[PDB]
Structure formats: structure tokens, C-alpha cells
Amino acid sequence: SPISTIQPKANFDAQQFAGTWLLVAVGSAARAEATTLHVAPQGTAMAVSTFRKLDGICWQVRQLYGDTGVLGRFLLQARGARGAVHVVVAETDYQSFAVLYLERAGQLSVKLYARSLPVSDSVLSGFEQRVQEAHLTEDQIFYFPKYGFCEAADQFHVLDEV
Ligand SMILES: CCCCCCCCCCCC(=O)O
Numbered sequence: 829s830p831i832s833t834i835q836p837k838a839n840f841d842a843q844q845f846a847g848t849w850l851l852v853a854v855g856s857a858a859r860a861e862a863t864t865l866h867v868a869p870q871g872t873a874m875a876v877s878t879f880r881k882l883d884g885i886c887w888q889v890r891q892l893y894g895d896t897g898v899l900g901r902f903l904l905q906a907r908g909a910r911g912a913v914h915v916v917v918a919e920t921d922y923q924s925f926a927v928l929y930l931e932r933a934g935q936l937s938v939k940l941y942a943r944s945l946p947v948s949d950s951v952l953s954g955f956e957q958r959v960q961e962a963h964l965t966e967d968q969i970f971y972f973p974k975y976g977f978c979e980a981a982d983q984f985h986v987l988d989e990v
């Protein structure tokens with residue numbers, strides 16, 4: 829459980845973290861790009877919609893990330909073939925960037941999200957520092973396009989996992 833060694837954002841405020849986030853980069857050893865996040869607090873949990881543009885078509889996945897008893901740490905419960913996904917919001921100023929850690933089957937990944945583009949050099953460099961600290965190399969970092977985003981899918985391309 830590599831993610832247990834990660835410190836969550838001190839006094840994480842779901843209300844301030846709400847809204848739209850754009851994926852900037854991902855650090856992962858895991859063996860179709862571009863992504864948008866819509867986060868809406870739901871009591872103690874977080875209602876989350878992710879959008880990805882594939883072959884010009886927008887696909888939406890609706891999920892619920894439950895509260896785990898620790899601020900900044902959430903859980904996407906397993907269901908069927910989908911394994912559980914642990915999430916920790918680490919560094920974030922709510923107004924420009926967010927560094928999230930995800931773990932599935934013991935494999936840790938790191939994602940950098942931004943409120944708008946481009947992200948500052950200091951944040952990008954900071955993210956890269958965290959990736960190397962997560963024992964991942966520069967070649968395990970995938971930087972996403974500064975275009976190709978979408979944030980609305982029709983009823984035929986919505987996967988509701990809630
Ligand atoms: C506050 C909860 C935030 C949850 C962020 C989830 C980010 C997208 C994770 C996508 C995982 C995957 O499908 O590989």
C-alpha cells in the first residue's frame with residue numbers, strides 16, 4: 829500500500845476543490861487521451877464525472893468517491909471487474925492545480941490536474957519531483973494534449989457507475 833505513505837492535503841476542503849479540472853500529466857507504470865473532471869461534493873462523498881474524447885465522441889463516466897474517515901482520502905469502491913481505487917488529494921491550492929495519487933492493486937500512480945492551461949513551471953516541476961519520489965521515471969510520465977477536451981456526452985455515451 830504505497831499510497832498509505834502519502835500525506836493528504838492538510839484540512840482538505842471539498843467545497844473549494846469543487847468544479848472543473850483538466851488533466852495535465854500522469855505518472856504511472858501501467859502497461860485515447862485528454863481528460864476533464866467535474867467534481868461535486870455530496871454530503872461526505874464526492875460525485876465525480878470524467879470526460880474523454882475518443883474518435884471525436886465525448887464519453888462520460890459518472891462515479892462516486894466515498895469518504896474514508898481521513899480528509900483528502902477517498903475510495904472508488906470495487907464493483908464487478910472494476911477493482912477498488914484509492915485516491916488521495918495531496919498538494920493543491922484549489923485555484924490552479926491539484927496533485928492526486930491513485931492506487932489500484934497495489935500500484936501507485938500520480939496525476940496533475942489544473943483549473944486552466946498552461947500550468948506554471950513551478951507546478952509542473954513540482955509534479956515531476958513527486959513522480960520521481962514515487963519511484964517512477966521520467967519515461968513513465970505522460971503529458972496530455974492542451975486540446976481535445978470535452979465535457980458533455982449524450983445519453984448513449986454515459987456510463988453510470990453510481
Ligand atoms: C475527490 C475524488 C476525485 C477522484 C478523481 C479521479 C480521477 C480519475 C481517475 C481515473 C482512473 C482510471 O480510470 O484509470
